[PDB]
Coordinates of C-alpha atoms in Angstrom, one line a residue:
Chain F
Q54 CA 15.9 -130.0 -251.4
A55 CA 15.8 -133.3 -253.4
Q56 CA 13.6 -135.1 -250.8
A57 CA 11.3 -132.1 -250.6
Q58 CA 10.9 -132.2 -254.4
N59 CA 9.9 -135.9 -254.2
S60 CA 7.3 -134.9 -251.6
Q61 CA 5.9 -132.3 -254.0
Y62 CA 5.5 -134.9 -256.7
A63 CA 3.9 -137.3 -254.2
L64 CA 1.2 -134.7 -253.4
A65 CA 0.6 -134.1 -257.1
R66 CA 0.1 -137.7 -257.8
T67 CA -2.3 -138.2 -255.0
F68 CA -4.7 -135.5 -256.2
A69 CA -4.4 -136.5 -259.9
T70 CA -5.1 -140.1 -258.9
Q71 CA -8.3 -139.1 -257.1
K72 CA -9.6 -137.0 -260.0
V73 CA -8.9 -139.6 -262.7
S74 CA -10.4 -142.4 -260.7
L75 CA -13.7 -140.5 -260.3
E76 CA -13.7 -139.8 -264.0
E77 CA -13.3 -143.5 -264.8
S78 CA -16.3 -144.4 -262.5
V79 CA -18.7 -141.9 -264.1
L80 CA -17.6 -142.8 -267.7
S81 CA -18.2 -146.5 -267.0
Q82 CA -21.7 -145.7 -266.0
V83 CA -22.1 -143.5 -269.1
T84 CA -21.0 -146.4 -271.3
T85 CA -23.7 -148.7 -269.8
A86 CA -26.3 -146.0 -270.3
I87 CA -25.3 -145.5 -273.9
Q88 CA -25.4 -149.3 -274.5
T89 CA -29.0 -149.5 -273.3
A90 CA -29.9 -146.4 -275.3
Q91 CA -28.6 -148.1 -278.4
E92 CA -30.6 -151.1 -277.5
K93 CA -33.9 -149.2 -277.3
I94 CA -33.3 -147.8 -280.8
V95 CA -33.0 -151.3 -282.1
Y96 CA -36.4 -152.0 -280.7
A97 CA -37.8 -148.8 -282.3
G98 CA -36.6 -150.2 -285.6
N99 CA -39.5 -152.7 -285.5
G100 CA -42.0 -151.3 -288.0
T101 CA -45.2 -152.9 -286.5
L102 CA -45.5 -150.8 -283.3
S103 CA -48.5 -148.5 -282.9
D104 CA -48.2 -144.9 -282.0
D105 CA -48.9 -145.4 -278.3
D106 CA -46.2 -148.0 -278.3
Chain L
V160 CA -6.6 -129.2 -267.4
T161 CA -3.0 -130.3 -267.4
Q162 CA -0.7 -131.0 -264.5
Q163 CA 2.9 -132.2 -264.1
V164 CA 3.1 -135.2 -261.7
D165 CA 6.8 -136.0 -261.9
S166 CA 10.1 -134.6 -263.0
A167 CA 9.2 -134.8 -266.6
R168 CA 5.8 -136.5 -267.1
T169 CA 2.9 -134.0 -267.5
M170 CA -0.6 -135.3 -267.7
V171 CA -4.2 -134.3 -268.5
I172 CA -6.0 -134.4 -265.2
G173 CA -9.6 -134.1 -266.5
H174 CA -11.3 -134.1 -269.9
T175 CA -13.6 -131.1 -270.6
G176 CA -17.1 -132.4 -271.2
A177 CA -17.1 -131.4 -274.9
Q178 CA -14.5 -134.1 -275.5
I179 CA -16.7 -136.7 -274.0
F180 CA -20.2 -136.0 -275.5
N181 CA -19.6 -133.5 -278.3
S182 CA -17.0 -135.1 -280.7
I183 CA -16.2 -138.0 -282.9
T184 CA -13.2 -140.3 -283.1
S185 CA -11.3 -140.0 -286.4
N186 CA -13.1 -143.1 -287.8
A187 CA -16.8 -142.4 -287.2
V188 CA -19.3 -143.9 -289.6
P189 CA -20.0 -141.4 -292.5
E190 CA -23.6 -140.6 -293.4
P191 CA -24.8 -142.6 -296.4
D192 CA -26.0 -139.3 -298.1
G193 CA -22.6 -137.7 -297.4
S194 CA -24.1 -134.6 -295.8
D195 CA -22.5 -134.7 -292.3
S196 CA -22.6 -136.9 -289.2
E197 CA -24.3 -135.5 -286.1
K198 CA -21.8 -135.1 -283.3
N199 CA -23.7 -134.2 -280.1
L200 CA -25.1 -137.1 -278.1
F201 CA -28.0 -135.1 -276.7
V202 CA -28.9 -133.5 -280.1
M203 CA -29.4 -137.0 -281.6
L204 CA -31.2 -138.3 -278.5
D205 CA -33.7 -135.4 -278.6
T206 CA -34.0 -135.8 -282.4
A207 CA -35.1 -139.4 -281.8
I208 CA -37.3 -138.5 -278.8
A209 CA -39.2 -136.0 -281.0
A210 CA -39.4 -138.5 -283.8
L211 CA -41.0 -141.2 -281.7
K212 CA -43.7 -138.9 -280.2
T213 CA -45.0 -138.2 -283.7
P214 CA -48.1 -139.9 -284.9
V215 CA -47.4 -141.8 -288.2
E216 CA -50.5 -144.0 -288.5
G217 CA -51.1 -144.5 -292.2
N218 CA -49.3 -141.2 -292.9
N219 CA -46.4 -141.7 -295.3
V220 CA -43.8 -138.9 -295.4
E221 CA -44.1 -139.1 -291.6
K222 CA -43.6 -142.9 -291.2
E223 CA -40.4 -143.0 -293.3
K224 CA -39.3 -139.6 -292.2
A225 CA -39.3 -140.7 -288.6
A226 CA -37.6 -143.9 -289.6
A227 CA -34.8 -142.0 -291.2
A228 CA -34.3 -139.8 -288.1
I229 CA -34.1 -143.0 -286.1
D230 CA -31.5 -144.5 -288.4
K231 CA -29.3 -141.3 -288.1
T232 CA -29.7 -141.6 -284.3
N233 CA -28.5 -145.2 -284.5
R234 CA -25.3 -144.3 -286.3
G235 CA -24.7 -141.3 -284.0
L236 CA -25.0 -143.4 -280.9
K237 CA -22.5 -145.9 -282.3
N238 CA -20.0 -143.1 -282.9
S239 CA -20.6 -141.7 -279.4
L240 CA -19.9 -145.0 -277.8
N241 CA -16.6 -145.3 -279.6
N242 CA -15.6 -141.8 -278.6
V243 CA -16.3 -142.3 -274.9
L244 CA -14.5 -145.7 -275.0
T245 CA -11.4 -143.9 -276.3
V246 CA -11.5 -141.5 -273.4
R247 CA -11.8 -144.4 -271.0
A248 CA -8.7 -146.0 -272.5
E249 CA -6.7 -142.9 -272.2
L250 CA -7.7 -142.6 -268.5
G251 CA -6.7 -146.3 -268.0
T252 CA -3.2 -145.5 -269.3
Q253 CA -3.1 -142.5 -267.0
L254 CA -3.9 -144.6 -263.9
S255 CA -1.4 -147.3 -264.8
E256 CA 1.3 -144.7 -265.2
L257 CA 0.5 -143.0 -261.9
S258 CA 0.7 -146.3 -260.1
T259 CA 4.0 -147.2 -261.7
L260 CA 5.5 -143.7 -261.1
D261 CA 4.7 -143.5 -257.4
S262 CA 6.4 -146.8 -256.7
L263 CA 9.5 -145.5 -258.5
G264 CA 9.3 -142.4 -256.3
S265 CA 9.1 -144.4 -253.0
Chain P
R107 CA -6.2 -149.4 -283.2
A108 CA -6.5 -145.7 -282.2
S109 CA -7.3 -146.8 -278.7
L110 CA -4.2 -148.9 -278.8
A111 CA -2.5 -145.8 -280.2
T112 CA -3.4 -143.9 -277.0
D113 CA -2.2 -146.8 -275.0
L114 CA 1.2 -146.8 -276.8
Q115 CA 1.2 -143.0 -276.5
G116 CA 1.0 -143.2 -272.7
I117 CA 3.7 -145.9 -272.7
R118 CA 5.9 -143.9 -275.0
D119 CA 5.6 -140.7 -272.9
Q120 CA 6.5 -142.8 -269.8
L121 CA 9.6 -144.0 -271.6
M122 CA 10.5 -140.4 -272.4
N123 CA 9.9 -139.5 -268.7
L124 CA 12.3 -142.2 -267.6
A125 CA 14.9 -141.1 -270.1
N126 CA 15.0 -137.6 -268.7
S127 CA 15.7 -138.6 -265.1
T128 CA 17.4 -136.2 -262.6
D129 CA 20.3 -136.8 -260.3
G130 CA 20.4 -136.6 -256.5
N131 CA 20.7 -132.8 -256.4
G132 CA 18.3 -131.5 -259.1
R133 CA 20.9 -132.1 -261.9
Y134 CA 20.4 -134.8 -264.5
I135 CA 22.4 -138.0 -264.4
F136 CA 20.6 -139.0 -267.7
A137 CA 22.4 -136.1 -269.5
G138 CA 25.5 -138.3 -269.5
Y139 CA 28.4 -136.0 -268.6
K140 CA 26.5 -132.7 -268.9
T141 CA 24.4 -133.1 -265.7
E142 CA 24.3 -129.3 -265.8
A143 CA 21.8 -129.5 -268.7
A144 CA 18.4 -130.9 -269.8
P145 CA 19.2 -133.9 -272.0
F146 CA 16.3 -134.8 -274.3
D147 CA 13.7 -133.5 -276.7
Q148 CA 10.3 -134.5 -275.5
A149 CA 8.8 -134.0 -279.0
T150 CA 10.6 -136.7 -281.0
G151 CA 13.8 -137.8 -279.1
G152 CA 16.5 -135.2 -279.8
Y153 CA 19.3 -136.0 -277.3
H154 CA 21.2 -133.0 -276.0
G155 CA 23.5 -134.7 -273.4
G156 CA 27.2 -135.1 -273.3
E157 CA 29.6 -136.7 -275.7
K158 CA 31.2 -139.2 -273.2
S159 CA 30.4 -141.4 -270.2

């Protein structure tokens, strides 16, 4: 029984690992996107751009 | 969604999207007028997008109005970045724990 | 500091997980003598185990 229980927990950890790793990847990309977004706002702060710009 | 991945340790195995893009950490920048801080990323992004596509040539009350919308967007983006970074950190701890626990199990 | 708080939160929960370890049959060696019982409070640290080694 004890060894079977260890097997159970091993399966659980496998699946949780996969899911959390994927989340990390996507969140990293999100962070870079938000960084560049913030950057663009800084540019928009310039008060000499014309309306086409 | 929670799951137990050991005899006692139980863990959050995925953060519902609202936590990521529709919340603020407990330390967000307050608005300078005290009204309330916008707290959805897309709401503020679309506010700014609408503001920029608005002609303001020589037309005060549109010039500064748009500028204020942009400022609010700036603050909002800052808070959003901090929130998502907090989520990243929590996941990093989760991964470190999982690595440590499995070795123990072996 | 809140990020570090979540970090310490994970580490603290890991400690609690270690403290509540089982024995080789599904009982708890970390209940001291009372292997028959669940030995710790996971909220704050209330210890429910035996009185003796």
